[PDB]
Symmetry: D2
Subunit: 256 residues, 4 copies
């Protein structure tokens, strides 16, 4: 099956930033034709820890910026919603509607996304067990979602730390396509970047249907996830690497 690579700057810092990243993602989509790329960027960081942190420039601006990316590069789009009313407006540009990890149990949000007819990707909450996602998918199917993804992004392990239990990949594969979030899984809630590559190598060796990676031209200047966003120049190398590992491991992937 065609491997999915969801990537883009964590937050829509500006339409300019988006075009710059999109340009590179477009180039890579031309090279890695066996990969389905989907450009991601949040129009709003609605769950920041601090009231003083960057959130975004609003829904309107963001959707317009995402529209430009899709229009200028012919790239599929994905962004996350935080309240039910945003599903409709966002569905006008997003090919995949993303559900935030903290909100993976909010029935109305999932239902709002499902009725748009768009694909839906749910980030597995840090409090959720792998088998607890079966009901999440049920809610979505009940709501009319026909293309569903579950994203592994780490589990609460003591305070201010997350651990990736790779057993979750084959478990969740029982009821949906599985995505591995390479950048959020190594973040320390409320020692990081050095683990992105090795853990993504593990994900494809175990077997998943795609990877999710935040990437920014200059991570140290990012207004969001400055410690975990992957430098844009490193994207190509990481993708080639996972495709290589995926291929050699592929014959051993177990059948659900």
């Amino acid at each position: 099956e065609k491997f999915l690579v969801i990537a883009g700057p964590c937050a829509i810092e500006s339409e300019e930033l988006l075009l710059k990243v999109g340009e590179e993602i477009k180039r890579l989509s031309e090279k890695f034709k066996e990969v389905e790329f989907v450009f991601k960027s949040s129009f709003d960081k609605a769950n920041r820890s601090s009231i003083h942190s960057f959130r975004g420039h609003g829904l309107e601006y963001g959707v317009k910026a995402l529209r430009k990316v899709k229009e200028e590069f012919g790239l599929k789009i994905t962004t996350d919603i935080h309240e039910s009313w945003q599903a409709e407006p966002v569905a006008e540009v997003a090919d995949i509607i993303q559900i935030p990890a903290f909100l993976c149990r909010q029935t109305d949000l999932l239902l709002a996304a499902a009725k748009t007819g768009r694909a839906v990707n749910v980030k597995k909450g840090q409090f959720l067990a792998p088998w607890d996602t079966k009901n999440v998918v049920e809610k979505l199917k009940f709501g009319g979602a026909k293309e569903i993804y579950l994203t592994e992004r780490g589990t609460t392990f003591g305070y201010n730390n997350l651990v990736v239990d790779f057993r979750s990949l084959p478990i969740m594969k029982q009821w949906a396509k599985v995505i591995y979030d390479a950048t959020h899984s190594v973040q320390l809630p409320g020692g990081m970047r050095e683990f992105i590559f090795p853990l993504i190598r593990a994900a494809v060796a175990v077997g998943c249907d795609g990877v999710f990676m935040e990437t920014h031209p200059e991570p140290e200047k990012a207004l969001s996830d400055a410690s975990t966003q992957l430098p844009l120049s490193q994207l190509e190398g990481i993708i080639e690497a996972i495709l290589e590992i995926r291929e050699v491991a592929s014959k051993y992937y177990e059948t659900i």
Copy 2:
């Protein structure tokens, strides 16, 4: 002020049920004058694991039933909101607006609640560290909130289990009044009841500003949290117990 006791049926299964429970909470209210009682019940279980589970009769019916309780018994009220728009209409009856555990980091919900001018009680997310609640309080203060509470309801401990780290009480007290949720803290996410009383005794021995307890005339028939709701008949005994323990223990509560 005085020790707070927030109690009531988990969900508004019918205003009839609320009246029955409200009568008992009213009685205890007259019996324990030193305690500030607050009637609680959710108009919507917006985060059930299953799509086929009981959610409720809607916000309107709920707010109406809650009004009835405040009118017939003169009891302060509290209920939880799940999306920003709900803050205003709910504030009409709710003396304290409750913020769900999974939603404790959703900035807009916190601000919407703070804007109503009402008191706000935030359930500490199972993914949050005690010190991480400082930023939660700051959001509410920035939003104009002046009466703020933080509720301990357990922390993710492996899969489908929560542990109560009592070190959280002293830590959270540095920036807000602390409430201990005696019924959700022993619930196993996605043997429980026997631990409610023991842990509520610990909470008072350690030191808190109030306790939160779900109570129902016949818990076995409850449409929500049937395994952990306290039988109405046992409420008085437990309240008297924690008041006696608090009386003796308070002498040793640490300053700030």
Copy 3:
């Protein structure tokens, strides 16, 4: 039943240190006649993290020092063993043989202790679940132990942190007398002292058969657990406090 208070300096830094602490413990035993005191001090810290840390002055010296304490004050004695051969020599002075947390599953060590005819106190391993102690007690009874204690000393919670799940007290009470280790439960393996008092208050409110506390005249100069050992001058106050809380909570202790 008579409440147990196990206390003494963590390590046998010298026979002098032991006599100084014993003197105070003897004084308190005369005051709190409803408490059974047992003087504790390790002749060897066999599990230190660093090869450069203090271990002790040997088995011979330690047993001789403990002998002096018992002889000079008429105090019961307890110390821990680390290998099977030490059970016999130690049993000559120790009224209670203590089994280290990391070694709670070592069959021969438990059996070696049990055949001495002495009481045995097993520190619950940081990796053990409360219900997993039923087999520990079975091994001891199988080995002839007639007086068995299980000590709660915290559970692994993420890296370099321990959490106390107070549900363990009533669970373990099903098959043995339960002791709460007030000082080791707040230590950070491999922010501490301020939680000793509140957590011990929780322990007695929930209900246990005794408490274990490391105490040293000048904790900052201790060669072991310098961050968690309770100042000797604070011992009396803590004991009076727990006896008070125990008494008022006692009528609510559940029957196993």
Copy 4:
């Protein structure tokens, strides 16, 4: 050196069993010349949960059976010790002395093993953080050990569950060769088998110096770890698989 593969039946149920398994490990040994195979089996299960469980036939019988394997097949050997005195006699046959997970902090055991001059493999305790293993290595070096290995076998994740934090591999590699225990890592303390292969693939994709695997002709009849021992017939396929994945992935293994 070359990639290490430590395999064999969990316990020495009979030297007959060891010979059968030894023959297959011998065959694979001739098939994969680039791999250094080491036969492993315990002469004593000194930490079983139940007093009524299989422990073994003793140290003498065990050491003898192990000799037979090394003599008949010319295979290097490894077995674990549980008390200091056992180091010397075991070193007679064991090329690598294994230190149990629960005993990874017992200084005397580590020193006794280091003194034999043999290589030492320490199973990382389920309670230890990855960086906490630095001190473990230092103990062994101080004891004269020169060939040191650290084995990842899971970390306590809530009750009766272990999680493999693959970040540990890169961290531990800073001070020792790293081995991944593919069978104990998925065992539930006090659904398992299906995760052995997936996680071993991750270990090699991430990067390690060897893998540890319990194997038995008929796991369902094993007297120990019956639920997780790998069927002998599947050993070859899994070894070939990890060698292919390693071949491709090694290109991206991080330096130091």
